[PDB]
Amino acid sequence: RVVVLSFELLHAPATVCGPKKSTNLVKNKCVNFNFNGLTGTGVLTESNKK
């Protein structure tokens, strides 16, 4: 019996990642962020963008 998993990478959100969940937000600082499967490094600030 052969079981293969076909994967497609899209923009839909993923709600479950790893054993750790919250990792409480820290703003106005340079941090490594992973949000909705998007991994990057940058400063997290508030803006007025709607």
Binding site: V3, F7, E8
Partner: protein, 49 residues
């Protein structure tokens, strides 16, 4: 993430031929859709996959 609790990927079965990373390492990779396809083949058809 599919399931991190039950992992048989380590030396639990007869034959393991894997590419990339094992199911243990899939916990850090986020993908959208998962289609699990189940089918039965013969002995000589394993090399054709």
């Amino acid at each position: 993430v599919a399931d991190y609790s039950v992992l048989y990927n380590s030396a639990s079965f007869s034959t393991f031929k894997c590419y990339g990373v094992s199911p243990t390492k899939l916990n850090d990779l986020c993908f959208t859709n998962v289609y699990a396809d189940s089918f039965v083949i013969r002995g000589d058809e394993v090399r054709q996959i």
